[PDB]
Amino acid sequence: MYKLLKVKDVVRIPPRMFTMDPKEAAKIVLRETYEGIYDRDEGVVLAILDVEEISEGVIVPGDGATYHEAIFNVLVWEPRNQEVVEGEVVEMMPYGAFIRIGPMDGLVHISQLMDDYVVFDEKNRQFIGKETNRVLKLGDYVRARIIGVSVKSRVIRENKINMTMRQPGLGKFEWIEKEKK
Amino acid sequence: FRYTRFEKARIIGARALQIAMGAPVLIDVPEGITPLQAALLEFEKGVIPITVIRPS
Amino acid sequence: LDGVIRPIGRHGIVGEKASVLARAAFEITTQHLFAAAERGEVDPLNGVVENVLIGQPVPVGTGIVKLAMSLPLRPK
Amino acid sequence: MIGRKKLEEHYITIAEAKELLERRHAEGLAENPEEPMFYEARVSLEHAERFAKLKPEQARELKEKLMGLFDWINERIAAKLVDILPEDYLDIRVIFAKEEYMPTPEEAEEIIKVIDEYRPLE
């Protein structure tokens, strides 16, 4: 689930591109500061849309560049707790499977998969159940719920989300339809 | 609206630092000039862009 | 300045109200005076001996003017 | 605090945020570095390209409509119902399993009656 923000911040225009229009020149500075950075307070800042209005310049002793107070629009993504998500199985591991719910991934361990005793087939990339002949393999569209989020650093790459599907009405979508009756 | 002696020596100081970091020059060329002396000639013709703030 | 005339040094105007770091480099007594304002005391700014001590422009002189400038900046 | 203040936020579904990526992708088209968008941006584009079930404009119209139907449905709950497209009381259970109010089969059917239109039926 994505959100759209409207946030003011102080913009630092260098004197190299000092002779451009103020709108897009303040846009090109603030865009290459926040894109692709996971904060622990709000989340993944994806991209800057546009710059509405801008203030005047103020010179500071020592640098020679200028300061402004702009208005811009930010598309964020916040994977908050116990949020019902949708994803795609894009990884096969012997201890679990990464479910891509967007820019990040969601790991479900092998014993939170389903209401079945689960054995990992080592030769293939699949799970085979004991009683039922259901097969969970690569590329299958699933539905899950967040249960734990491990936030370590500012980088998107180093943070992983644990989910689970041991609830009525989750898993693969054609498994869900036959559980309606 | 005449400047004082403290404001005239700061406007030159800030403009001589922009003129070294890029900030394309007006008609000031000839043949070799230190960046401080470029700010004095631009100030002579009265084409400085920087204006002061008068706190009151 | 305060209705009774004061001296100029070590018991008067320097020893009177200022920043607490301003009284440190004058009247070499400091374990009397610097440990007195060790107990419950803040120290903001805005002397002349402090901004030179920390690396800031002092308030007198040319660190008093504030500039402002817009930015099309066409050469013509 | 990010910046000085945060003053306004809204909730965006996956079909609505697809257009914000492609209009951003319309820049680049700048040709001096050619501007290839970075990797994790292109990954999140593919999640918008495959799960686009509705029109971008008709999803914005529906989110205004679903808030006025029930008082206990805010904008955040209404944006969840567009992405799932519930058909019966099974999906009403799994979304609202950790909520303050569990709906009656009368009130859950009234949500379906609005979303009986605009369905792809294929």
Coordinates of C-alpha atoms in Angstrom, one line a residue:
Chain A
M1 CA 0.0 0.0 0.0
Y2 CA 1.4 3.3 -1.2
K3 CA 0.9 6.9 0.1
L4 CA 1.3 10.4 -1.4
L5 CA 3.0 13.1 0.7
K6 CA 3.3 16.8 0.7
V7 CA 6.4 17.9 2.6
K8 CA 8.5 21.1 2.8
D9 CA 12.3 20.9 3.1
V10 CA 15.2 23.3 2.7
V11 CA 16.9 23.1 -0.7
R12 CA 20.6 23.8 -1.4
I13 CA 21.2 24.9 -5.0
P14 CA 24.9 24.9 -5.9
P15 CA 26.3 27.8 -7.9
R16 CA 27.2 25.5 -10.8
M17 CA 23.6 25.4 -12.1
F18 CA 23.0 28.9 -10.7
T19 CA 21.6 30.1 -14.1
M20 CA 18.6 27.8 -14.5
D21 CA 14.9 28.2 -13.7
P22 CA 14.3 27.9 -9.9
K23 CA 11.6 25.2 -10.1
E24 CA 13.4 22.3 -11.8
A25 CA 16.8 23.3 -10.5
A26 CA 15.6 22.9 -6.9
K27 CA 13.9 19.7 -8.1
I28 CA 17.1 18.1 -9.3
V29 CA 18.8 18.7 -5.9
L30 CA 16.2 17.3 -3.6
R31 CA 15.5 14.3 -5.9
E32 CA 19.0 12.9 -5.5
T33 CA 18.8 12.9 -1.7
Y34 CA 15.8 10.8 -0.6
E35 CA 15.1 8.3 -3.3
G36 CA 15.5 4.6 -2.4
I37 CA 16.1 5.2 1.3
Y38 CA 14.3 3.3 4.1
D39 CA 13.7 5.4 7.2
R40 CA 12.8 3.7 10.5
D41 CA 10.1 6.3 11.2
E42 CA 8.1 6.4 7.9
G43 CA 9.5 4.0 5.2
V44 CA 10.7 3.7 1.6
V45 CA 10.7 7.1 -0.2
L46 CA 10.3 6.2 -3.8
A47 CA 10.4 9.3 -6.1
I48 CA 9.8 13.0 -6.1
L49 CA 6.9 14.0 -8.3
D50 CA 7.0 17.8 -8.8
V51 CA 7.8 21.2 -7.1
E52 CA 4.9 23.5 -6.6
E53 CA 6.2 26.7 -5.0
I54 CA 9.6 28.1 -3.9
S55 CA 10.8 30.8 -1.5
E56 CA 13.6 33.3 -1.8
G57 CA 17.4 32.7 -1.4
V58 CA 19.5 33.4 1.8
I59 CA 23.3 33.5 1.6
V60 CA 25.3 32.0 4.5
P61 CA 28.9 33.0 5.4
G62 CA 31.4 30.4 4.1
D63 CA 29.8 28.3 1.4
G64 CA 28.5 30.6 -1.4
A65 CA 25.5 28.4 -2.4
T66 CA 21.9 29.4 -1.7
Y67 CA 19.1 28.1 0.5
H68 CA 15.4 27.9 -0.4
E69 CA 12.2 26.5 1.2
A70 CA 10.3 24.5 -1.4
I71 CA 7.1 22.5 -1.6
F72 CA 7.2 19.0 -3.2
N73 CA 5.2 15.8 -3.5
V74 CA 6.6 12.4 -2.4
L75 CA 5.4 8.8 -3.1
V76 CA 6.2 6.6 0.0
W77 CA 5.6 3.0 0.8
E78 CA 5.0 1.9 4.4
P79 CA 4.7 -1.8 5.2
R80 CA 3.2 -1.4 8.6
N81 CA 2.4 -4.3 11.0
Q82 CA -0.5 -6.9 10.5
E83 CA -1.2 -5.4 7.1
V84 CA -2.9 -7.7 4.6
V85 CA -0.7 -7.8 1.5
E86 CA -0.5 -9.6 -1.9
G87 CA 2.6 -11.0 -3.5
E88 CA 4.5 -13.2 -6.0
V89 CA 6.8 -16.2 -5.2
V90 CA 10.1 -15.0 -6.8
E91 CA 12.6 -17.2 -4.9
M92 CA 13.0 -20.8 -3.8
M93 CA 15.1 -21.7 -0.8
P94 CA 15.4 -25.0 1.2
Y95 CA 14.4 -23.1 4.4
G96 CA 11.7 -20.7 3.1
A97 CA 10.6 -18.6 0.2
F98 CA 10.8 -14.8 -0.5
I99 CA 7.4 -13.3 -1.5
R100 CA 7.8 -10.0 -3.4
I101 CA 5.1 -7.6 -2.0
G102 CA 6.5 -4.6 -3.9
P103 CA 10.0 -3.0 -3.7
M104 CA 10.8 -5.3 -0.7
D105 CA 10.3 -9.0 0.0
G106 CA 8.5 -11.1 2.5
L107 CA 9.9 -14.4 3.9
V108 CA 7.6 -17.2 5.1
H109 CA 9.3 -20.1 6.8
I110 CA 8.4 -23.7 5.9
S111 CA 6.2 -24.4 8.9
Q112 CA 4.1 -21.3 8.6
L113 CA 3.2 -22.1 5.0
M114 CA -0.1 -24.0 5.2
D115 CA -2.3 -26.4 7.2
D116 CA -0.2 -29.4 6.2
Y117 CA 3.0 -31.1 7.2
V118 CA 5.5 -29.6 4.7
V119 CA 8.5 -31.4 3.2
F120 CA 10.9 -29.5 0.9
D121 CA 11.8 -31.4 -2.3
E122 CA 15.5 -31.0 -2.6
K123 CA 15.8 -32.0 -6.3
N124 CA 13.1 -29.7 -7.6
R125 CA 12.0 -26.2 -6.5
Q126 CA 8.6 -27.1 -5.0
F127 CA 6.8 -28.1 -1.8
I128 CA 4.9 -31.4 -1.7
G129 CA 2.2 -32.0 0.9
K130 CA 1.6 -35.3 2.7
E131 CA -2.2 -35.9 2.5
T132 CA -3.3 -33.4 -0.1
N133 CA -1.7 -33.2 -3.5
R134 CA -1.3 -29.4 -3.5
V135 CA 1.9 -28.1 -5.0
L136 CA 3.4 -24.8 -4.1
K137 CA 6.2 -23.8 -6.6
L138 CA 7.7 -20.9 -8.4
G139 CA 5.7 -18.0 -9.8
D140 CA 2.5 -18.7 -8.0
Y141 CA 0.4 -15.8 -6.8
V142 CA -0.2 -15.9 -3.0
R143 CA -1.8 -13.8 -0.3
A144 CA -0.4 -13.4 3.2
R145 CA -0.2 -11.3 6.4
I146 CA 2.7 -9.6 8.0
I147 CA 3.6 -10.9 11.5
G148 CA 7.1 -9.5 12.1
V149 CA 9.3 -6.8 10.5
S150 CA 13.1 -6.8 11.2
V151 CA 14.4 -3.2 10.6
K152 CA 18.1 -3.0 10.8
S153 CA 19.5 -0.2 8.5
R154 CA 18.7 2.6 6.1
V155 CA 19.2 0.5 3.0
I156 CA 16.3 -1.3 1.4
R157 CA 18.5 -4.3 0.7
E158 CA 19.3 -5.2 4.3
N159 CA 15.8 -5.3 5.7
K160 CA 13.6 -8.3 5.4
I161 CA 10.0 -9.0 6.5
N162 CA 8.6 -12.2 8.1
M163 CA 5.1 -13.2 7.2
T164 CA 2.8 -16.2 7.7
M165 CA -0.1 -17.9 6.0
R166 CA -1.6 -20.2 8.7
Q167 CA -5.0 -18.6 8.6
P168 CA -8.3 -19.4 6.9
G169 CA -8.4 -17.5 3.6
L170 CA -4.7 -17.2 2.6
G171 CA -2.2 -18.9 0.3
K172 CA -2.6 -19.3 -3.4
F173 CA -5.7 -17.7 -4.9
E174 CA -7.1 -20.9 -6.4
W175 CA -6.7 -22.6 -3.0
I176 CA -8.7 -19.7 -1.5
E177 CA -11.6 -20.1 -4.0
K178 CA -12.1 -23.8 -3.2
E179 CA -12.1 -22.9 0.5
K180 CA -15.1 -20.7 0.0
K181 CA -17.4 -23.7 0.0
Chain B
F1 CA 19.6 54.0 0.0
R2 CA 23.4 54.2 0.0
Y3 CA 25.3 51.2 1.4
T4 CA 27.5 51.5 4.3
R5 CA 31.2 50.4 4.5
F6 CA 30.3 47.1 6.1
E7 CA 27.7 46.0 3.6
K8 CA 29.8 47.0 0.6
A9 CA 32.7 44.8 1.8
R10 CA 30.4 41.8 2.2
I11 CA 28.6 42.0 -1.2
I12 CA 32.0 42.0 -2.9
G13 CA 33.1 39.1 -0.7
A14 CA 30.1 36.9 -1.5
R15 CA 30.2 37.7 -5.2
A16 CA 33.9 36.9 -5.5
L17 CA 33.3 33.4 -4.1
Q18 CA 30.5 32.6 -6.5
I19 CA 32.6 33.8 -9.5
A20 CA 35.2 31.2 -8.6
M21 CA 32.7 28.3 -8.2
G22 CA 31.0 28.6 -11.6
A23 CA 28.4 31.5 -11.8
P24 CA 29.0 32.8 -15.4
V25 CA 30.5 36.3 -15.5
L26 CA 29.2 39.4 -17.3
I27 CA 31.3 41.5 -19.6
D28 CA 34.4 41.5 -17.5
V29 CA 36.9 39.6 -19.6
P30 CA 40.3 41.1 -20.4
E31 CA 43.3 38.9 -20.4
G32 CA 43.6 37.9 -16.8
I33 CA 42.3 39.2 -13.5
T34 CA 42.1 37.7 -10.0
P35 CA 38.4 36.8 -9.1
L36 CA 38.4 39.5 -6.4
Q37 CA 39.1 42.1 -9.0
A38 CA 36.3 40.8 -11.2
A39 CA 33.8 41.6 -8.4
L40 CA 35.1 45.2 -8.1
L41 CA 34.5 45.9 -11.8
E42 CA 31.0 44.4 -11.7
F43 CA 30.2 46.6 -8.7
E44 CA 31.5 49.7 -10.5
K45 CA 28.8 49.5 -13.2
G46 CA 26.1 48.8 -10.6
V47 CA 24.9 45.5 -11.9
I48 CA 25.2 43.5 -8.6
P49 CA 22.3 41.1 -8.2
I50 CA 22.7 40.7 -4.4
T51 CA 20.5 43.0 -2.3
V52 CA 20.6 43.7 1.4
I53 CA 18.0 43.2 4.1
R54 CA 17.4 46.1 6.4
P55 CA 16.2 44.8 9.8
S56 CA 13.7 47.2 11.4
Chain C
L1 CA 25.1 51.3 34.8
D2 CA 23.4 49.9 37.9
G3 CA 23.0 53.0 40.1
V4 CA 26.1 52.4 42.1
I5 CA 29.4 52.9 40.4
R6 CA 31.4 49.8 39.7
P7 CA 35.1 49.0 39.1
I8 CA 36.5 47.8 35.8
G9 CA 38.3 44.5 36.7
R10 CA 38.0 41.3 38.7
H11 CA 35.2 42.6 41.0
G12 CA 33.1 44.8 38.7
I13 CA 32.0 44.7 35.1
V14 CA 33.9 41.6 34.0
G15 CA 33.0 39.9 37.2
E16 CA 29.4 41.1 36.7
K17 CA 26.9 39.7 34.3
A18 CA 28.0 38.1 31.0
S19 CA 28.4 34.7 29.5
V20 CA 30.0 32.3 32.0
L21 CA 32.8 31.5 29.5
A22 CA 33.6 35.2 29.2
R23 CA 34.6 35.2 32.9
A24 CA 36.9 32.2 32.4
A25 CA 39.8 33.9 30.4
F26 CA 39.9 36.9 32.7
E27 CA 40.7 37.1 36.5
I28 CA 42.8 33.9 36.7
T29 CA 41.0 32.6 39.8
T30 CA 38.9 30.2 37.9
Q31 CA 38.5 27.4 40.4
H32 CA 36.7 30.0 42.5
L33 CA 34.5 31.2 39.6
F34 CA 34.2 28.4 37.0
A35 CA 33.2 25.9 39.6
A36 CA 30.7 28.4 41.0
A37 CA 28.7 28.2 37.8
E38 CA 29.2 24.5 37.7
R39 CA 26.0 24.2 39.7
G40 CA 22.7 24.8 37.8
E41 CA 23.7 27.1 34.9
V42 CA 23.2 27.5 31.2
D43 CA 25.2 29.6 28.7
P44 CA 23.7 30.7 25.4
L45 CA 25.9 32.7 23.1
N46 CA 26.4 36.2 21.8
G47 CA 29.7 37.4 23.4
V48 CA 32.7 38.2 21.4
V49 CA 35.1 35.8 23.2
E50 CA 32.7 32.9 22.7
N51 CA 32.1 32.8 19.0
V52 CA 35.9 33.1 18.4
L53 CA 36.3 30.2 20.9
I54 CA 33.9 27.9 19.0
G55 CA 34.4 28.9 15.4
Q56 CA 31.6 31.3 14.5
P57 CA 31.6 34.8 13.1
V58 CA 31.4 37.4 15.9
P59 CA 28.3 39.7 16.0
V60 CA 30.2 43.0 15.5
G61 CA 31.5 44.1 12.2
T62 CA 30.5 42.3 9.0
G63 CA 28.8 39.4 10.6
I64 CA 25.7 41.6 11.2
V65 CA 24.4 41.9 7.6
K66 CA 22.0 39.4 6.1
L67 CA 21.7 39.0 2.3
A68 CA 18.8 37.7 0.1
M69 CA 18.7 37.1 -3.6
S70 CA 16.3 35.6 -6.2
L71 CA 17.4 33.3 -9.0
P72 CA 16.5 33.6 -12.6
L73 CA 19.9 35.5 -13.0
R74 CA 19.9 36.2 -16.7
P75 CA 23.3 37.6 -18.0
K76 CA 22.1 40.2 -20.5
Chain D
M1 CA 11.1 14.5 12.0
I2 CA 11.6 14.5 8.2
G3 CA 12.1 18.2 7.3
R4 CA 10.3 20.9 9.2
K5 CA 6.7 19.5 9.2
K6 CA 4.5 16.9 7.6
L7 CA 1.1 18.4 6.7
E8 CA -0.9 16.2 4.4
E9 CA -1.0 12.5 3.5
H10 CA -3.4 10.3 1.4
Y11 CA -3.8 6.6 0.7
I12 CA -3.1 5.2 -2.7
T13 CA -4.0 1.8 -4.1
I14 CA -1.8 -0.2 -6.5
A15 CA -3.8 0.7 -9.6
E16 CA -3.6 4.5 -8.8
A17 CA 0.2 4.5 -8.1
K18 CA 0.9 2.8 -11.4
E19 CA 0.3 6.1 -13.2
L20 CA 2.6 8.0 -10.9
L21 CA 5.5 5.6 -11.9
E22 CA 4.8 5.8 -15.6
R23 CA 4.5 9.6 -15.7
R24 CA 7.8 9.7 -13.7
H25 CA 9.1 7.2 -16.3
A26 CA 8.1 9.7 -19.0
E27 CA 11.0 11.7 -17.8
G28 CA 14.2 10.3 -19.1
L29 CA 13.7 11.5 -22.1
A30 CA 16.5 13.6 -20.7
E31 CA 19.2 12.0 -22.8
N32 CA 22.3 13.5 -21.1
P33 CA 22.9 10.3 -19.1
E34 CA 19.8 8.8 -20.9
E35 CA 18.4 8.4 -17.3
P36 CA 17.8 4.7 -16.7
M37 CA 15.6 4.5 -13.6
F38 CA 17.3 2.7 -10.7
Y39 CA 16.8 -1.0 -10.0
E40 CA 14.4 -1.1 -7.0
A41 CA 12.2 1.5 -8.8
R42 CA 11.9 -0.8 -11.8
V43 CA 11.1 -3.8 -9.5
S44 CA 8.2 -1.9 -7.9
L45 CA 7.0 -1.0 -11.4
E46 CA 6.6 -4.6 -12.3
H47 CA 4.3 -5.2 -9.3
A48 CA 2.1 -2.4 -10.6
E49 CA 2.1 -3.7 -14.2
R50 CA 0.8 -7.2 -13.4
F51 CA -1.8 -6.4 -10.6
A52 CA -3.5 -3.5 -12.5
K53 CA -7.1 -4.8 -12.2
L54 CA -9.1 -1.5 -12.5
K55 CA -8.9 1.9 -14.2
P56 CA -6.8 4.5 -12.5
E57 CA -9.7 7.1 -12.5
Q58 CA -12.5 4.8 -11.5
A59 CA -10.5 3.7 -8.4
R60 CA -10.3 7.3 -7.3
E61 CA -14.1 7.7 -7.7
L62 CA -14.8 4.5 -5.8
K63 CA -12.7 5.5 -2.8
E64 CA -14.9 8.6 -2.3
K65 CA -18.0 6.5 -2.6
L66 CA -17.1 3.8 -0.1
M67 CA -16.5 6.3 2.7
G68 CA -20.1 7.6 2.6
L69 CA -21.7 4.2 2.8
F70 CA -20.7 3.3 6.3
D71 CA -19.4 5.5 9.1
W72 CA -16.9 2.9 10.4
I73 CA -15.2 2.7 7.0
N74 CA -12.5 5.4 6.7
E75 CA -10.3 6.1 3.6
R76 CA -7.7 3.6 4.8
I77 CA -10.1 0.7 5.1
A78 CA -11.8 1.6 1.8
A79 CA -8.5 1.5 -0.2
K80 CA -7.9 -2.0 1.1
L81 CA -11.2 -3.2 -0.4
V82 CA -10.4 -2.0 -3.9
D83 CA -7.2 -4.1 -4.1
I84 CA -8.8 -7.3 -2.8
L85 CA -12.2 -7.1 -4.6
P86 CA -14.2 -9.2 -2.1
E87 CA -16.9 -11.5 -3.2
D88 CA -18.4 -13.0 0.0
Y89 CA -18.0 -13.1 3.8
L90 CA -14.7 -15.1 3.6
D91 CA -12.7 -12.0 2.6
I92 CA -14.6 -9.8 5.1
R93 CA -13.3 -12.2 7.8
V94 CA -9.6 -12.1 6.8
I95 CA -9.3 -8.3 6.4
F96 CA -11.3 -7.6 9.6
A97 CA -9.8 -10.3 11.8
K98 CA -7.7 -7.8 13.8
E99 CA -10.2 -4.9 13.8
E100 CA -12.4 -3.3 16.4
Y101 CA -15.6 -4.2 14.6
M102 CA -16.6 -7.5 12.9
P103 CA -19.4 -6.9 10.3
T104 CA -22.8 -8.6 10.2
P105 CA -23.8 -10.5 7.0
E106 CA -26.3 -7.7 6.3
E107 CA -23.7 -4.9 6.4
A108 CA -21.1 -7.0 4.6
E109 CA -23.5 -7.6 1.7
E110 CA -24.2 -3.9 1.3
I111 CA -20.5 -3.4 0.6
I112 CA -20.7 -6.0 -2.2
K113 CA -23.8 -4.3 -3.8
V114 CA -21.8 -1.2 -4.5
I115 CA -18.9 -3.2 -6.0
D116 CA -21.3 -5.3 -8.0
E117 CA -20.7 -2.9 -10.8
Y118 CA -17.2 -2.2 -12.4
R119 CA -16.3 -5.9 -12.4
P120 CA -14.3 -7.4 -15.2
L121 CA -16.5 -10.6 -15.2
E122 CA -13.8 -12.6 -16.9

